[PDB]
Design a protein around this ligand. Structure first.
Ligand SMILES: Cc1cc2nc3c(=O)[nH]c(=O)nc-3n(C[C@H](O)[C@H](O)[C@H](O)COP(=O)(O)O)c2cc1C
Ligand SMILES: Cc1cc2nc3c(=O)[nH]c(=O)nc-3n(C[C@H](O)[C@H](O)[C@H](O)COP(=O)(O)O)c2cc1C
Ligand SMILES: Nc1ncnc2c1ncn2[C@@H]1O[C@H](COP(=O)(O)OP(=O)(O)OP(=O)(O)O)[C@@H](O)[C@H]1O
Ligand SMILES: Nc1ncnc2c1ncn2[C@@H]1O[C@H](COP(=O)(O)OP(=O)(O)OP(=O)(O)O)[C@@H](O)[C@H]1O
Lengths: 363, 365
């Protein structure tokens, strides 16, 4: 061999990843060796748990498919890597990434197993949390798309329906002083037309209020937390695009009264727009900063080095459906501005000195 | 001074482990390999006799600049363990994903720093993670787009009848006023003409929005049902594992290729999977079956059955109408968009109750 066996055992004993060695006895794989790393990870003392099967790490959490795959791989005589939910001495849960390798010891005419085990609890937590944030943000983004669609369509349609109603009113005023035998039939037809216009407006508001229904809650929220959550969702691709991230956060100006999912979605949209504007940019730098502002408010600034704003673009940004992308919708900024203004702040934009875009809002 | 296993036995276990295990010796800024196991020779495609007593940075190669390198060196310098993931290349140049844990230990007797590295091939998991990360962004964009599109379509359909009634009323009123002698008749005719043109322009604005949002490639290509079912399951059936929901994909390779737009069928299936998982939230038996079969007109039928709360008696004929929902926070657009997409693709989408009290959806393509 290449190493003195004492050195190998020493390395195993002081390794940080849990290492155990077990002996096949019937339908039990009794532990015969554990290292102090495993004692730490499990909170169990070797003298207590030796020469038993490690199923008690599951405890009362019997039914998970990791158990089944591991058991059948053991019978089949094949290594297997899985993840399991294990409980420590004090009952606390952790996720355990486990590799079992079965080995046939010829000299003893026996089967042994070697198990390497890592604590993937923190990673599993953050991944599940991001899954939750992703699903909730998807639902809120489709909701806001529907809402701004209805609002813009209603506003654009308001003028023709009002013109029709006024025309019917004026025509009835003109025909009031008439003797033509058809005049009553005309009056009935025009009255029914006006009622149709009224019902069209009613249908507009019916759909508008059926989709835009939702709790307009406001709670104390940490800006650091929601900025990190929004970066986690929206700024995934920053590394591959070589985007420089800077979070300049102020702990004294960190708690605001807001609906966290709505500010999350405004920031996610800003981050996506900034990353897109810096796809062909030589300098790719994103700065997020919070500062105190007047009226006991807090101002958030997001600056990039992207393609920025053409001269006429800035005053159109917040209008619904204004877009510079061939496949863009132009609803993100309009919804964002309405959300910021509904929360008691004002959202607005400006060009920065680097040729990119800076967005600010207050809460 | 304890011994619970003969050290020879421990070496035997390490030698036959399936996870790569190496041991390295600190000699300056190079951590020379002094031990590798056959698992590592497999994973790396290198022979120990060739690579022994060298640093393993050559696994990165020309991929010099990665954050793993910075994290690892600072952890090595600091004398502290580290777990990372890296992109390494084998002997033949092929790439692989390597989950690597290094633990530095100071052995007093030799007065030296050694390292123990446990390493796994995490190639497939990283692949699936990147693939799901792309799909989620694509699904976000397309779901937002389809929501807006069906919103416009339904709003247009609901408004169409009143505006046509208004136009017909103006036409009939002009017919009545034709051949009249009241002096106000010309002014009334002008007003009614302008009202009719306003209704026309309202229809024009409706179609403006409908064609502005519904712009998009409606392409159709040959697609494997197994593949798109797996992508949709990866997105929609994430929580099936933890809810102990039994998933069954009964796919037939002879009836596997269809002509479809993959992103639209992806979003229909994602919605079906979410609906099926939701209907089995308060169900004790949670079983989801997907099945494909040949169908007439050179088509293929896909069935998705669950053991959920299913459909009340009057629910079935309302399912596909826009805005029909049984959820307090639901939108009721998923099934309407799905059916319009399937019919635009040449198939028929429909639903029925199954014998287990749940829901069965079928479509053809
Ligand atoms: C070497 C080795 C290490 C194991 N380590 C763990 C562990 O850390 N946590 C755990 O939950 N199960 C672990 N298992 C699996 C359990 O010991 C047990 O074999 C498995 O859950 C199947 O149990 P069953 O077939 O009796 O239901 C390990 C198995 C082996 C062979
Ligand atoms: C035990 C051990 C195993 C290692 N295995 C690998 C490996 O498989 N692949 C790899 O790219 N780097 C591996 N490294 C890290 C490299 O040896 C090196 O420390 C790292 O690339 C930093 O290189 P630098 O010192 O030039 O910055 C390992 C380090 C140790 C201590
Ligand atoms: N960094 C930026 N900040 C703000 N507005 C920007 C920025 N870069 C470009 N814009 C302009 O703002 C417009 C609207 O952006 P908004 O986020 O509202 O929607 P979008 O990104 O175009 O599309 P979608 O709503 O589908 O995300 C863009 O089309 C572009 O003209
Ligand atoms: N698993 C299910 N299978 C079939 N029909 C279901 C299921 N769950 C609920 N339904 C009924 O069918 C309707 C289909 O709704 P659809 O999937 O179109 O949207 P939603 O889930 O209500 O909301 P959203 O569109 O926002 O996702 C539900 O509103 C309900 O009436």
């Amino acid at each position: 061999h290449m190493i003195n066996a004492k050195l190998l055992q020493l390395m195993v004993e002081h390794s940080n990843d849990g290492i155990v060695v077990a002996e096949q006895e019937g339908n039990e794989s009794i532990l015969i060796y554990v290292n102090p790393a495993f004692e730490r990870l499990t909170g169990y003392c070797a003298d207590d748990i030796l020469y038993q099967d490690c199923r008690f790490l599951q405890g009362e959490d019997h039914d998970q498919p990791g158990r089944a795959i591991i058991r059948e791989a053991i019978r089949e005589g094949r290594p297997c890597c899985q993840v399991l939910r294990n409980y420590r001495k004090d009952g606390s849960l952790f996720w355990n990434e486990l590799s079992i390798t079965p080995v046939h010891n010829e000299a003893d005419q026996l089967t042994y197993y070697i198990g390497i085990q890592r604590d993937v609890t923190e990673h599993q937590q953050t991944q599940a949390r991001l899954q939750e944030l992703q699903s909730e943000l998807v639902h809120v983004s489709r909701l806001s798309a529907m809402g701004e669609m209805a609002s813009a369509l209603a506003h654009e349609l308001n003028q023709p329906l009002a013109a029709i109603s006024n025309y019917m009113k004026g025509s009835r005023r003109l025909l009031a002083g008439s003797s033509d035998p058809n005049t009553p039939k005309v009056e009935s037809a025009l009255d029914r037309a006006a009622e149709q216009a009224l019902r069209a407006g009613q249908i507009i508001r019916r759909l508008r209020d059926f989709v835009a229904r939702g709790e307009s809650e406001k709670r104390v929220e940490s800006l650091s937390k929601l900025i990190e959550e929004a970066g986690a969702l929206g700024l995934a691709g920053a590394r591959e695009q070589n985007v420089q991230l800077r979070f300049s956060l102020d702990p004294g100006a960190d708690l605001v009264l807001a609906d966290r999912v709505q500010i999350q979605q405004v920031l996610v949209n800003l981050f996506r727009n900034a990353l897109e504007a810096m796809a062909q940019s030589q300098r790719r730098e994103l700065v997020v900063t919070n500062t105190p502002a007047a009226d006991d408010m807090i101002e958030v600034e997001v600056s990039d080095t992207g393609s920025g704003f053409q001269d006429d673009v800035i005053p159109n940004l917040f209008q619904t459906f204004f877009t510079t992308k061939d496949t863009g919708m132009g609803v993100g900024l309009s919804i964002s501005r309405s959300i910021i203004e509904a929360h008691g702040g004002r959202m607005w934009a400006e060009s920065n000195a680097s040729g990119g875009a800076t967005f600010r809002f207050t809460l």
